[PDB]
Design a protein around this ligand. Sequence first.
Ligand SMILES: [Zn+2]
Lengths: 456, 134, 85, 161, 75, 48, 111, 159, 107, 91
Amino acid sequence: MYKKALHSFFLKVHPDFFHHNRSQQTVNESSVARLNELLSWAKAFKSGHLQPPPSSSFTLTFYRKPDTIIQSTFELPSNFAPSDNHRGTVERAVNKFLRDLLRRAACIDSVTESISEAEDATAARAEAKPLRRRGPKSLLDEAVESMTVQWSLTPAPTLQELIEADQILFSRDLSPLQSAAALSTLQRHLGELNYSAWESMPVIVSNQFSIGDLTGTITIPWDFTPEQFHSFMAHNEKGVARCREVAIQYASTIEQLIAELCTALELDDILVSCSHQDALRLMELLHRNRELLIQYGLSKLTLEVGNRHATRANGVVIINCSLTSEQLRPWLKAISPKLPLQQRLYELSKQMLESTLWHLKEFRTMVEPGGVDAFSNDCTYAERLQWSKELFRIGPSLAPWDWSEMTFVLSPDVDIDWANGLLALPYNFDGDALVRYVEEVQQEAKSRKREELLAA
Amino acid sequence: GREGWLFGQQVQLHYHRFPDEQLITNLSRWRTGETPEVYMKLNYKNPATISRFLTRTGHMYPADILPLNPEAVVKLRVAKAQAIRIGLYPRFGNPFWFRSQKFRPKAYQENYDPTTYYNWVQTDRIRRYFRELE
Amino acid sequence: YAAMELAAEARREIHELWLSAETALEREKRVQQVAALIEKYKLDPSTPREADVSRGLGDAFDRLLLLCLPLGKTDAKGTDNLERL
Amino acid sequence: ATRWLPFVSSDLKDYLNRYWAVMFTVGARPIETGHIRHYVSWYCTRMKVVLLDHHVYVEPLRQQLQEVSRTPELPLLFVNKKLVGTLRDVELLEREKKLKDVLHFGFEWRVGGSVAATNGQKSLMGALPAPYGDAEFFRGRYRGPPVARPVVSLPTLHPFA
Amino acid sequence: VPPPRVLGGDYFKTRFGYSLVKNSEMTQGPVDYSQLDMWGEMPRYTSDMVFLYLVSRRRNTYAVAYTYEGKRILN
Amino acid sequence: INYVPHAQLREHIDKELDKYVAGKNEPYPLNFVGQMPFLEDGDGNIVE
Amino acid sequence: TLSPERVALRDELARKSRLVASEGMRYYNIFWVRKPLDTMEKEYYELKRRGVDHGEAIRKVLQGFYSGLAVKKRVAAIQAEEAKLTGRFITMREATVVLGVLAKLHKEQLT
Amino acid sequence: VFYSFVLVMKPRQRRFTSQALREIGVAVYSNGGLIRSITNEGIMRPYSRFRDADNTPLTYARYIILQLDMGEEEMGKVDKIIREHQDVLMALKLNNLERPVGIRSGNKELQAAYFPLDTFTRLEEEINWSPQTSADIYTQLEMNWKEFSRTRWSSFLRN
Amino acid sequence: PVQKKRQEQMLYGVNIPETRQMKFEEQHPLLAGALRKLEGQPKGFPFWYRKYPTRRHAYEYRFSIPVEMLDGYNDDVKKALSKGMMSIQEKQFAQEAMYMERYAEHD
Amino acid sequence: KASHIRIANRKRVEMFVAKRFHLPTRLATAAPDIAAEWHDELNPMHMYPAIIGIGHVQPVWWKCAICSHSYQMSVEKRVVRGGGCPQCVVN
Ligand SMILES: [Zn+2]
């Protein structure tokens, strides 16, 4: 019935569709949440569970995309009180508010509007003189169901996943104990206050408290009070939105430049280690000097940016952040002759990386160990590939035993820690010898059980 | 020293079963919304897949012990016959057997126990990482 | 990036054109007015890439197809208009 | 009327709905399965044993069994879609003579009091409520026959029995 | 009970009689994909293993010994 | 479906026989059984 | 539960998102994964209300998903890079690992 | 009719192998048929050693997979050619291509509920999957994947 | 089953239900459904369908494929679909179709 | 239920008719001297003296041992009727 109208209304005024205008979005999510709890406790009140109405009267405003504000007011009757006598009029009030929203959004037909108005008028007339009767969804049920199932705001992320996502930072000047307490007492017990606009940037905790900090970040004072934080955000909400914005354009500006650069030089990636501010200067320099790079033959090579002019044996060229326009021409003429060598090494490195990952994956699938760590130790790619090949060779001979507890790792020396579930081997290790040792262990366990049973 | 390495490497607390398991779990959780392609591989080209349903000897298990979809059984049998014909599967024997089993003991046990259902290397990695950090 | 907004603008222009040609008495004005859009938005099949607004014309495509129909007389090679769409 | 097909299902509930008494086991616990088979066959009740080692849907069925039984214990018995438990619970029911009924009719007597501990025929001597209590403050109360106890362990006949 | 802990390569060699580290010629830079053995899961019979077969019967018993290559050593 | 015309048959046969020979830059493919086969220097002689 | 058409496109989207993720992107450490997927399916719903050739519609939403993931990756890179450059604060995870590893080293040196 | 063959050929010189395959293809073409594809499958070691026509066991054999379209009579002609060939130690013929295995025997209701054209149109690699092939590869092919795979080797690349 | 087989031989889409997935798709999607979703030349409505009410009105090609459906494909594909590649079962059906054409009083 | 045997490991035939006719009448068996001349260069690979057998009416290539001439003749003419090399009979 009203499924189409609610679908259109949400498709129009959902916050997810307004990412260009963060102000419109930051009004929309709030209005949507308000409507959500309003309809939720309206349904609860109808089913029973009489409760006082949060914000018994209020106006909600939504923004639209003509590719346009709609404000509607809920004005619960003056004589409202939680009881059966009032149990009927609140439904008609919420239906009036919903019809006003729908009509103003222009996503409901006039005939359906009249249908709902006649429904409410009939209910009001029935209230006086009782009747008897011995189902299709109404506006309230349709709205709550559509909001819940498909048009629902994404739930706020949790603290356990946030700490792992590295969204939270802290100044080391705070002691470990004088840092853990604020998290413990302000996130486990104080996660409810969090506002939707706040989960979009990293949060650092330090002694001070401001918005002047790393790109797209906010700061938090030690043992901050929640209402003090609310006052801060109400005081300079412009600052946090602006910092998020400037951060996202700072990132996206790097992105396009990287993209058309990689396409123009038929290379894959631009990696950065030095400041991205200087990375942008180098990006602009190569932006205006593209064709010169093709002339020199720089192509089909992922480019790495560091602090010292150099080139890694993996084929990446590590470039300095501090460069000028005239001094690069000597640099290009200097590194021109070895460019083909770097390119061939790059291709060989990709081939060996693919082979190593394939072998590690095969060993994981057939000898599932619960963990393999080949890329932690700084060895040569040839050594890592050789170690992966040896593990893959062992493979089935090692299969008959469960290694869900042990973790295979690459080491400069062998260690076999059965208690802590570690198994570290050098790239030069005999798979035959390792199978020998595990078979020795199995034989010892078997003989031990036989001897114990015979003694018993 | 090297400076790209510090910005490349990231510190991990605990190892993963495989590095993308958390992403896969979250993707599956969203796909289910909460808050078999083996008939394609059961053929003469997949010795491991056909061996996944055979005994230690290369023959058939009892129907009660290893019951199957009848189409799966037919495909298994024809694939085994064709592979043995070509010589891609031993005419007697069953490699991939241990590889296919699932209730495997531990290296220091003799039977599978239903109840089962900071390493120095990474410490040194962290030490060298921080040493380069300054 | 501009192709998306251009498809939206073409859709809106077809919306307003459907109203403009709601009392299209003279056949000539309608046929040439609809023909103009073909070249202005380069709807010819020679533009298979994203530049084509046809793939983005989800529903206004049918209205544009229907708009150029009445070709009773004085075709001036009118049928090619229908044939391109 | 139709060809014979071995039954398989990824849902523990399908097994419960289909088979009266169903036991899930593994090949690594032969003795426990043998004991439960001994008890069930002694009470002459049709029972289906399913080995999970080669069963497809092994992980689904295993997690479902673990969540329904609140323990990883592969040898598990089910009657009337309920859990009787592992060999220890089966032995307990055999001890207090409730296993006959849990198998045949599918319910455990909740009467209270043990029937195994008996000197002769089963009667109610010592069941009536005691006025004022104080069953302990009659120091000269009847204490029963002189139960004897072993001095040493008398080594077990077999490591299994 | 998990078995004991072993940490040194030289200690492993001295304790077990066979070095774990290959410690051989470096054949590095090989092909990027390797072929498996026909019987991967089977035990690794090295060159110097004498395979003796003991066949029993009701009245008799035979014993022969073969080289790793299938050559009979003794009648 | 990329059929092999009779004219292109010998060329395709030779180019396909040259698939696992030896001394090659791009990686060798896995055969239909997913097992890398032996390489042959040329004329079908196994070396490695 | 879910409605069958919704679960169908959600399944195809989940597979495609997995492929753009830990596959070629190699972005195992993604954060707040729910928002991108939901905004993409909502955008698909808009494109289907309009009528956008489901194949083309899914291509478009997937490309938008890729762009969002890339910008997220690089903003995370910005914060990590500048936080490491400034030695005053680093992050929480390394604090946990250091405060654990120092205790483990203390125990070892005690042994 | 869509037919497929797996040939196990003794690893002779390249010229001899090419001569054998050329003769087979010439038989196919002179018998009014088409070869959908030919694929050298490398030289492998079968678990059971086939004896040459000289009754010598051969440890190594080259594998060739042929996919072709031929009528039944001339398919039989070329089939006998292949079987009686000198080099072919074995020739496995796939009859299961137009109709998937198991429905002729599986279930009566489903015997006439399949579309032969679905399997006829696609190649043998798409009916019988290798261990390496999985629907992820088909999803990757359906994706453009050019701007998706470009960032794959960065984390390992820098370290 | 006999009647199902011969009904399938006679009629074209008798297998396909209104849901557009015959029984084999439901259990084996990876075989029946097309693996590659190709954007090539999606053909339009067949305006020539009046000519072939049943499979026996087109028996000179494999799978009773009318020639109007083969307009754009390659000569190798047409040869693969020619009579010479026809199977024995479909050849027998073509023999039946000749006499149906000769002696049938209505479609 | 009929039992077959593969002649020269290539041609599967019924065991009865094989033991009675095929085996004793193979070209490399009945007339090895004639099998010697078999032209292994100009003569298709799927035909060789271990299979074709005497009585083959189709002509095949023969390499002469005396004048090293390659001539085309039928196996039945060569073995049964006593065929010979045209150049040799000319000489
Ligand atoms: Zn002569």
